Amino acid sequence: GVVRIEEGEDRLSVFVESEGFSKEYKLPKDARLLVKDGDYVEAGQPLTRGAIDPHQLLEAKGPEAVERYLVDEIQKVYRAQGVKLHDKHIEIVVRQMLKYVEVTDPGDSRLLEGQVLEKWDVEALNERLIAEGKVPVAWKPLLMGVTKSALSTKSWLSAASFQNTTHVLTEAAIAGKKDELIGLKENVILGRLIPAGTGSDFVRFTQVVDQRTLKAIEEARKE
Amino acid sequence: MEIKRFGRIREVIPLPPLTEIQVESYKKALQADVPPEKRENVGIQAAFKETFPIEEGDKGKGGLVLDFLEYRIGDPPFSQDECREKDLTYQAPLYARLQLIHKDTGLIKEDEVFLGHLPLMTEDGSFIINGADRVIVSQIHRSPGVYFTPDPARPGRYIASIIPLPKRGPWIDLEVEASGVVTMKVNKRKFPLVLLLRVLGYDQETLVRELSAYGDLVQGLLDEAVLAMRPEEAMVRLFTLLRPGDPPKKDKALAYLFGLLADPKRYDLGEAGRYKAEEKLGVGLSGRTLVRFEDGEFKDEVFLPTLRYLFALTAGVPGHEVDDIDHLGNRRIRTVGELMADQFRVGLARLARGVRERMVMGSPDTLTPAKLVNSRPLEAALREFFSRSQLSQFKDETNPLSSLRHKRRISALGPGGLTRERAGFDVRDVHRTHYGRICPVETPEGANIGLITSLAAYARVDALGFIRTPYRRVKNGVVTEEVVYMTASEEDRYTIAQANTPLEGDRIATDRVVARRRGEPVIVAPEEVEFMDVSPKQVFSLNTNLIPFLEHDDANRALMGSNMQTQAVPLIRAQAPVVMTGLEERVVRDSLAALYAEEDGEVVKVDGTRIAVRYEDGRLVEHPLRRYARSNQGTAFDQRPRVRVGQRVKKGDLLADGPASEEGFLALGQNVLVAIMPFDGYNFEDAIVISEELLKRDFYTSIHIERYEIEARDTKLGPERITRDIPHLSEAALRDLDEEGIVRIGAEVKPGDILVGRTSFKGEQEPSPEERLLRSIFGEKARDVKDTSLRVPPGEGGIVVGRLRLRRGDPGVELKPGVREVVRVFVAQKRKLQVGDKLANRHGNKGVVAKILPVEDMPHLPDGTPVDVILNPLGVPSRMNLGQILETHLGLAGYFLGQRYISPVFDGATEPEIKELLAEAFNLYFGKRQGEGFGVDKREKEVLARAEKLGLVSPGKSPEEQLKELFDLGKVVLYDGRTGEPFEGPIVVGQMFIMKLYHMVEDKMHARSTGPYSLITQQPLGGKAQFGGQRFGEMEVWALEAYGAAHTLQEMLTIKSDDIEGRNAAYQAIIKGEDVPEPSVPESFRVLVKELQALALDVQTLDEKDNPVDIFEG
């Protein structure tokens, strides 16, 4: 919308009045604003100056949006110190920061239980396609941070290692709760052959042949 | 040799008797040499007296009391040397004279009642606690008083402070919050402070009077008209909220600590606590937070004048400002003698409740002191002190300096009154105060940096631990001789001037004078002067002074040097730095590791084993020379005869040197000839090259004595003897154990070879797998009594030279619970240099070696003689330690010039002064060459040929000159022994003093293909025969993860640690050479699953089709 500041050396604030709703945007008596007296806008943006809250933003502006800020933001300091580094990296991190979403109008699980994107769609693109009906089971924009993050990761073996394991197992144990061992910290706590590189699913299930020892293996097949 | 000394400014006074921080502090605590009726308090006195007019529950009625009169000092049950070989605390019985009057009367004075072993100090400054020596250090805490300061979790508002001496009074904080109130925090308690204003006689209109009108915070502290009531009533809402479990009106039994007397509250006798809480507060206070028994009630003294500077601080006027909580005039120092005395208010503590419970059960007539006291709480609590507190440190005996360095230390850490390992960014930092009190370039690299540190040379601690630093007084333009030792709070109001500043005869010389005030650096008028420092040494730490050209070194890469100089290890043919700073000699004397003579006489008998003299008709002492004894790091210091068998002496001069000393002068390392430059990346990044030459001369060699020990216990399977008789051992083995179990002295040691046999029965079981494959590596199956002898641990070793024996029962030999008979063999070794060994300069250029090169390589000068160490340049730039480069110059100087010099702190020589001798050396050096008949050759000129094109040389001048010109320019031409052609650029060369540090690869370095598998965790640990067992952390893995290192990861989590199956399996595997591993399912996995069920929860296992596993097959 539009704007207009009011008073000087007593009660500071500002107002974001579009057409009708004049949102009372205060200031603690010591703020360094920068969007003068008149200006013009669009949704969720740096008004005062200072910072940019994660959650508060998101909510009223979307998930990607934050992401963008995130990384970049982060980068800004890194850059300010000689740091160089493909952005990609920082991104990848971020990714999980989204991974979870809350719920409303469900078609199967609890009416809140935080949740994984994919899990939401192999179930929200599967309760309207082959198994039509029930309810799409929508979600919303949810933000975790490394910390809060991991913690809700479905896997437990890994899930342990943090805060107070008790809890994790506790609840877990109760319902079946499986893992699938898809991850690193996962397959390692146990000491498997990591689902990576050599221990992946595309370059380890390969059997090598030696040109001549392929014709002593071609006469024991047509028998 | 012949010594010149630079700069003047004559030290009006040598330096403090150093070791003063431990001796001069500990003697004025335990006054056993001063009539007992005398003694002006503190230490044991003020400790026996703070807790001695010790009554008995019930005031007046039933008798029983017990008081004090004087304390008797003990006499060493043992001598310094024995109490050490025998593992004793070199304590010293301490008796006290008690007498307890009854209610019916009786003057029964039980003649000295043993209270506990109080350890006597040493000439050194350390002690003898359970064997070795420790350094009861000196901490530094917040000096008592009141300052206030702002609020932390609430900006804009202010909190008040009331700190009395610690361990003699509660912590008190008057923080004003948002509720309007001014609550009172005390020993973990936050109640409405209005409840303590009324207890000290304050109404509902005099709390609004002296402190309202301004700051309407008094109308939050006010409306609570349910507690603005009665005097002995605001005492039960205070004794029913401060101490639950007891609601009696005996709320002046507990509310009797935190105030009157000195049981708890009080900040010194009226010093820092009062003299400070007077000038900044509301003037006038004697000695405790208010006062009780005055006429009836409590007549407040210091809970209102400080509540009249904290609220006039949250609005207020001038004069009322925050205090700096890290200022020295605001900071204290707990010396030695007092820290044991405080473990006496704690040694006399659990003892004033070991009698007040003994006069309730036992007849009150049948009582006489020495029958009421057990005296275990001063032994167990004053032995607990020299045996465990984070402050009672080992003692760095590397060299003698460190020894002392240690002492000088200052810690913040501490038992209770101290600082944890997670704070301090308002303290750690160096403060505008320190100047001359606490050096700023001595603290440790990281982890601790700040909190810990060494005192600033001259500076002395005094009275209530106030650091005092020496200044010289003037008559406003003139210059006195009088010198002013003064505290900091006594310095923030004087306009002091550098000593660096020009002074004629004995006064001021010039009008542009540099001076400081409080802390700010300004220029001042010649008579606008108060004082003037005694010198700069007054400014830097003790060792931070040994620095030669500090005047030209970064501040950072410097401490490194003062430091490191500590991790300095001695060598034989030691030698003191060519360039010194004077003190250089003194350090050696105050350390005491060197031997001097009290009175002047003359020597008669003289050998490595002793030195007999015949002082001036003062008899004939005969002090022995500790020969090759072990340090604590291992080191191995030994004094050495340095006098003749016939000569009048000099009133006590080097009666013979110490470890790393040369005729009275500190010889940390060995000044050697260096060549600054790059070699085939053979000093790269921070490496250094050496010339075989030193090994030849055996120049950098260290002696070291490793201490081995053993313990034989008493068991059910039988007692653990120790005889030169142990089965299957083939005589050629025992071969050197004449002692009947011990190795003879002078025996050459190897590894695995026997050191101390020791047979224990054990058994009752049968071997099996995972040790019967090894086993025969440790048995041949067996015996009814096993080997378990000592044997030399991998790598170490050397030539023996010392054996000690004990046995549960000797006079003073006391063995723990279960043990019997001890033994300790002492074997040492020569160590020369070994590629990789560590070494550096005082100038912070730490640098190890990678290539010892033959005297055939080793870029040599033109006159044949080769350099020694190549000190690449690169390591100098990014760091700012010029000076070192300056030492090299003076070096070449001091070479041909034949001498030593002393470039003290900011008083050293100078470029113009040095060029002087440098040329003075060239005129000589070259006079030597032309004199021989030569005079520069193609090689040289060719250099000078470019030396000019480079402008370092003045063009248009004979070759010869371009040399001197250059020579004086501190460099010269250098020949690369390998190729006749010299380097193409003059080279800075010279004699650089260096050193050998604590670290020496020899003690690091390991490798294990297999070996000792733990039995606990099921993996590689310890190491009897073969050794080591490297660790592996997450990082490692993650990265491992980084690469698709699959197996490299898995093989790194199995057959190389837990999974017992594998390690053997694998181990075998190679013995034949097969693929080798492929472990079934990693140990740990199963373990856990089982540690799981071993706590409920199945913890099953399925695949892709979700089906039952078979995870354990057994």
PDB file of N, CA, C and O in Angstrom, chain B residues 221-261:
ATOM      1  N   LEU B 221       8.437  -0.164  45.796  1.00  0.00           N
ATOM      2  CA  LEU B 221       9.174  -0.615  46.981  1.00  0.00           C
ATOM      3  C   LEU B 221       8.273  -0.278  48.178  1.00  0.00           C
ATOM      4  O   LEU B 221       8.474  -0.784  49.288  1.00  0.00           O
ATOM      5  N   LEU B 222       7.266   0.564  47.919  1.00  0.00           N
ATOM      6  CA  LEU B 222       6.319   1.051  48.931  1.00  0.00           C
ATOM      7  C   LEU B 222       5.024   0.268  49.179  1.00  0.00           C
ATOM      8  O   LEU B 222       4.947  -0.480  50.156  1.00  0.00           O
ATOM      9  N   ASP B 223       4.003   0.442  48.328  1.00  0.00           N
ATOM     10  CA  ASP B 223       2.730  -0.265  48.558  1.00  0.00           C
ATOM     11  C   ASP B 223       2.886  -1.783  48.659  1.00  0.00           C
ATOM     12  O   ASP B 223       2.997  -2.521  47.664  1.00  0.00           O
ATOM     13  N   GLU B 224       2.902  -2.196  49.924  1.00  0.00           N
ATOM     14  CA  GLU B 224       3.011  -3.566  50.415  1.00  0.00           C
ATOM     15  C   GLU B 224       2.739  -3.253  51.895  1.00  0.00           C
ATOM     16  O   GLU B 224       3.575  -3.509  52.772  1.00  0.00           O
ATOM     17  N   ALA B 225       1.570  -2.643  52.129  1.00  0.00           N
ATOM     18  CA  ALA B 225       1.115  -2.219  53.455  1.00  0.00           C
ATOM     19  C   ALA B 225       0.733  -3.377  54.382  1.00  0.00           C
ATOM     20  O   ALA B 225       0.019  -3.168  55.368  1.00  0.00           O
ATOM     21  N   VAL B 226       1.209  -4.586  54.057  1.00  0.00           N
ATOM     22  CA  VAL B 226       0.972  -5.802  54.858  1.00  0.00           C
ATOM     23  C   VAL B 226       2.318  -6.226  55.485  1.00  0.00           C
ATOM     24  O   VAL B 226       2.374  -7.091  56.372  1.00  0.00           O
ATOM     25  N   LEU B 227       3.393  -5.591  55.007  1.00  0.00           N
ATOM     26  CA  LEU B 227       4.760  -5.859  55.465  1.00  0.00           C
ATOM     27  C   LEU B 227       5.489  -4.555  55.866  1.00  0.00           C
ATOM     28  O   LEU B 227       6.697  -4.561  56.115  1.00  0.00           O
ATOM     29  N   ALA B 228       4.761  -3.441  55.908  1.00  0.00           N
ATOM     30  CA  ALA B 228       5.340  -2.163  56.328  1.00  0.00           C
ATOM     31  C   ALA B 228       4.996  -2.020  57.813  1.00  0.00           C
ATOM     32  O   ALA B 228       4.739  -0.908  58.303  1.00  0.00           O
ATOM     33  N   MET B 229       5.013  -3.176  58.498  1.00  0.00           N
ATOM     34  CA  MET B 229       4.695  -3.353  59.931  1.00  0.00           C
ATOM     35  C   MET B 229       5.877  -3.756  60.859  1.00  0.00           C
ATOM     36  O   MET B 229       6.995  -4.022  60.405  1.00  0.00           O
ATOM     37  N   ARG B 230       5.560  -3.812  62.158  1.00  0.00           N
ATOM     38  CA  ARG B 230       6.441  -4.147  63.299  1.00  0.00           C
ATOM     39  C   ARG B 230       7.903  -4.629  63.087  1.00  0.00           C
ATOM     40  O   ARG B 230       8.229  -5.203  62.044  1.00  0.00           O
ATOM     41  N   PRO B 231       8.801  -4.366  64.081  1.00  0.00           N
ATOM     42  CA  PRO B 231      10.236  -4.735  64.113  1.00  0.00           C
ATOM     43  C   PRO B 231      10.622  -6.243  64.295  1.00  0.00           C
ATOM     44  O   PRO B 231      11.376  -6.777  63.475  1.00  0.00           O
ATOM     45  N   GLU B 232      10.149  -6.922  65.350  1.00  0.00           N
ATOM     46  CA  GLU B 232      10.459  -8.358  65.555  1.00  0.00           C
ATOM     47  C   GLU B 232       9.476  -9.267  64.788  1.00  0.00           C
ATOM     48  O   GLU B 232       9.449 -10.493  64.988  1.00  0.00           O
ATOM     49  N   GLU B 233       8.674  -8.632  63.926  1.00  0.00           N
ATOM     50  CA  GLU B 233       7.656  -9.269  63.080  1.00  0.00           C
ATOM     51  C   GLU B 233       8.103  -9.345  61.612  1.00  0.00           C
ATOM     52  O   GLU B 233       7.650 -10.215  60.867  1.00  0.00           O
ATOM     53  N   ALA B 234       8.967  -8.419  61.194  1.00  0.00           N
ATOM     54  CA  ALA B 234       9.495  -8.411  59.835  1.00  0.00           C
ATOM     55  C   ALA B 234      10.743  -9.281  59.911  1.00  0.00           C
ATOM     56  O   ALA B 234      11.592  -9.255  59.025  1.00  0.00           O
ATOM     57  N   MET B 235      10.820 -10.049  61.001  1.00  0.00           N
ATOM     58  CA  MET B 235      11.919 -10.971  61.308  1.00  0.00           C
ATOM     59  C   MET B 235      11.488 -12.433  61.183  1.00  0.00           C
ATOM     60  O   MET B 235      12.324 -13.338  61.205  1.00  0.00           O
ATOM     61  N   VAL B 236      10.181 -12.654  61.071  1.00  0.00           N
ATOM     62  CA  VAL B 236       9.637 -14.000  60.948  1.00  0.00           C
ATOM     63  C   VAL B 236       9.084 -14.265  59.532  1.00  0.00           C
ATOM     64  O   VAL B 236       8.676 -15.385  59.221  1.00  0.00           O
ATOM     65  N   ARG B 237       9.067 -13.229  58.684  1.00  0.00           N
ATOM     66  CA  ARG B 237       8.608 -13.336  57.286  1.00  0.00           C
ATOM     67  C   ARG B 237       9.912 -13.356  56.485  1.00  0.00           C
ATOM     68  O   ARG B 237       9.921 -13.498  55.260  1.00  0.00           O
ATOM     69  N   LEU B 238      11.002 -13.198  57.236  1.00  0.00           N
ATOM     70  CA  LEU B 238      12.374 -13.175  56.746  1.00  0.00           C
ATOM     71  C   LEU B 238      13.093 -14.463  57.145  1.00  0.00           C
ATOM     72  O   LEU B 238      14.022 -14.897  56.467  1.00  0.00           O
ATOM     73  N   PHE B 239      12.670 -15.052  58.261  1.00  0.00           N
ATOM     74  CA  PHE B 239      13.261 -16.292  58.768  1.00  0.00           C
ATOM     75  C   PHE B 239      12.372 -17.488  58.396  1.00  0.00           C
ATOM     76  O   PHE B 239      12.692 -18.637  58.719  1.00  0.00           O
ATOM     77  N   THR B 240      11.260 -17.194  57.708  1.00  0.00           N
ATOM     78  CA  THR B 240      10.279 -18.191  57.229  1.00  0.00           C
ATOM     79  C   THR B 240      10.229 -18.128  55.679  1.00  0.00           C
ATOM     80  O   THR B 240       9.326 -18.688  55.039  1.00  0.00           O
ATOM     81  N   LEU B 241      11.215 -17.437  55.096  1.00  0.00           N
ATOM     82  CA  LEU B 241      11.357 -17.281  53.640  1.00  0.00           C
ATOM     83  C   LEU B 241      12.859 -17.286  53.220  1.00  0.00           C
ATOM     84  O   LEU B 241      13.198 -17.318  52.029  1.00  0.00           O
ATOM     85  N   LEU B 242      13.740 -17.261  54.222  1.00  0.00           N
ATOM     86  CA  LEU B 242      15.197 -17.302  54.034  1.00  0.00           C
ATOM     87  C   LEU B 242      15.694 -18.680  54.469  1.00  0.00           C
ATOM     88  O   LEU B 242      16.655 -19.223  53.909  1.00  0.00           O
ATOM     89  N   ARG B 243      15.026 -19.225  55.487  1.00  0.00           N
ATOM     90  CA  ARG B 243      15.348 -20.541  56.044  1.00  0.00           C
ATOM     91  C   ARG B 243      14.111 -21.330  56.542  1.00  0.00           C
ATOM     92  O   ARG B 243      13.672 -21.168  57.690  1.00  0.00           O
ATOM     93  N   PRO B 244      13.532 -22.193  55.675  1.00  0.00           N
ATOM     94  CA  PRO B 244      12.357 -23.001  56.036  1.00  0.00           C
ATOM     95  C   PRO B 244      12.677 -24.131  57.021  1.00  0.00           C
ATOM     96  O   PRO B 244      13.835 -24.532  57.183  1.00  0.00           O
ATOM     97  N   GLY B 245      11.634 -24.655  57.660  1.00  0.00           N
ATOM     98  CA  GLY B 245      11.811 -25.743  58.607  1.00  0.00           C
ATOM     99  C   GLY B 245      11.785 -25.319  60.066  1.00  0.00           C
ATOM    100  O   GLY B 245      11.643 -26.171  60.956  1.00  0.00           O
ATOM    101  N   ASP B 246      11.912 -24.012  60.321  1.00  0.00           N
ATOM    102  CA  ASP B 246      11.926 -23.485  61.695  1.00  0.00           C
ATOM    103  C   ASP B 246      11.340 -22.042  61.876  1.00  0.00           C
ATOM    104  O   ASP B 246      12.036 -21.051  61.601  1.00  0.00           O
ATOM    105  N   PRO B 247      10.061 -21.905  62.335  1.00  0.00           N
ATOM    106  CA  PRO B 247       9.510 -20.544  62.514  1.00  0.00           C
ATOM    107  C   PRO B 247       9.687 -19.793  63.865  1.00  0.00           C
ATOM    108  O   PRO B 247       8.913 -18.865  64.133  1.00  0.00           O
ATOM    109  N   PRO B 248      10.693 -20.149  64.717  1.00  0.00           N
ATOM    110  CA  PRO B 248      10.801 -19.406  65.981  1.00  0.00           C
ATOM    111  C   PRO B 248      11.266 -17.954  65.852  1.00  0.00           C
ATOM    112  O   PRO B 248      11.749 -17.533  64.795  1.00  0.00           O
ATOM    113  N   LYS B 249      11.098 -17.197  66.941  1.00  0.00           N
ATOM    114  CA  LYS B 249      11.501 -15.789  67.001  1.00  0.00           C
ATOM    115  C   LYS B 249      13.010 -15.701  67.240  1.00  0.00           C
ATOM    116  O   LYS B 249      13.538 -14.664  67.659  1.00  0.00           O
ATOM    117  N   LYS B 250      13.681 -16.821  66.987  1.00  0.00           N
ATOM    118  CA  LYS B 250      15.124 -16.924  67.108  1.00  0.00           C
ATOM    119  C   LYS B 250      15.604 -16.600  65.681  1.00  0.00           C
ATOM    120  O   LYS B 250      16.412 -17.329  65.093  1.00  0.00           O
ATOM    121  N   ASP B 251      15.058 -15.509  65.128  1.00  0.00           N
ATOM    122  CA  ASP B 251      15.381 -15.033  63.778  1.00  0.00           C
ATOM    123  C   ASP B 251      16.493 -13.989  63.842  1.00  0.00           C
ATOM    124  O   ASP B 251      16.636 -13.153  62.943  1.00  0.00           O
ATOM    125  N   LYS B 252      17.245 -14.045  64.943  1.00  0.00           N
ATOM    126  CA  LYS B 252      18.396 -13.175  65.216  1.00  0.00           C
ATOM    127  C   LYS B 252      19.522 -14.136  65.633  1.00  0.00           C
ATOM    128  O   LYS B 252      20.509 -13.755  66.280  1.00  0.00           O
ATOM    129  N   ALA B 253      19.323 -15.403  65.266  1.00  0.00           N
ATOM    130  CA  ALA B 253      20.275 -16.479  65.516  1.00  0.00           C
ATOM    131  C   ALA B 253      20.901 -16.745  64.148  1.00  0.00           C
ATOM    132  O   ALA B 253      22.082 -17.081  64.045  1.00  0.00           O
ATOM    133  N   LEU B 254      20.084 -16.584  63.104  1.00  0.00           N
ATOM    134  CA  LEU B 254      20.518 -16.746  61.717  1.00  0.00           C
ATOM    135  C   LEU B 254      20.689 -15.360  61.094  1.00  0.00           C
ATOM    136  O   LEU B 254      21.666 -15.105  60.386  1.00  0.00           O
ATOM    137  N   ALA B 255      19.721 -14.479  61.344  1.00  0.00           N
ATOM    138  CA  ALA B 255      19.778 -13.112  60.835  1.00  0.00           C
ATOM    139  C   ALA B 255      20.898 -12.397  61.591  1.00  0.00           C
ATOM    140  O   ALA B 255      20.973 -11.168  61.595  1.00  0.00           O
ATOM    141  N   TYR B 256      21.762 -13.197  62.225  1.00  0.00           N
ATOM    142  CA  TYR B 256      22.903 -12.710  63.007  1.00  0.00           C
ATOM    143  C   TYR B 256      24.244 -12.951  62.303  1.00  0.00           C
ATOM    144  O   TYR B 256      25.300 -12.567  62.805  1.00  0.00           O
ATOM    145  N   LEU B 257      24.201 -13.616  61.155  1.00  0.00           N
ATOM    146  CA  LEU B 257      25.415 -13.835  60.390  1.00  0.00           C
ATOM    147  C   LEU B 257      25.531 -12.604  59.496  1.00  0.00           C
ATOM    148  O   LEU B 257      26.220 -11.640  59.837  1.00  0.00           O
ATOM    149  N   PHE B 258      24.819 -12.661  58.372  1.00  0.00           N
ATOM    150  CA  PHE B 258      24.742 -11.631  57.326  1.00  0.00           C
ATOM    151  C   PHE B 258      24.728 -10.151  57.789  1.00  0.00           C
ATOM    152  O   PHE B 258      24.038  -9.319  57.191  1.00  0.00           O
ATOM    153  N   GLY B 259      25.479  -9.814  58.830  1.00  0.00           N
ATOM    154  CA  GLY B 259      25.480  -8.440  59.294  1.00  0.00           C
ATOM    155  C   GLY B 259      26.505  -8.097  60.355  1.00  0.00           C
ATOM    156  O   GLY B 259      27.666  -7.830  60.041  1.00  0.00           O
ATOM    157  N   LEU B 260      26.078  -8.093  61.615  1.00  0.00           N
ATOM    158  CA  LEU B 260      26.971  -7.757  62.715  1.00  0.00           C
ATOM    159  C   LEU B 260      28.245  -8.599  62.687  1.00  0.00           C
ATOM    160  O   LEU B 260      28.531  -9.285  61.703  1.00  0.00           O
ATOM    161  N   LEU B 261      28.994  -8.545  63.786  1.00  0.00           N
ATOM    162  CA  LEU B 261      30.266  -9.258  63.939  1.00  0.00           C
ATOM    163  C   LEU B 261      31.026  -9.432  62.617  1.00  0.00           C
ATOM    164  O   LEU B 261      31.006  -8.555  61.743  1.00  0.00           O
TER     165      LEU B 261
END
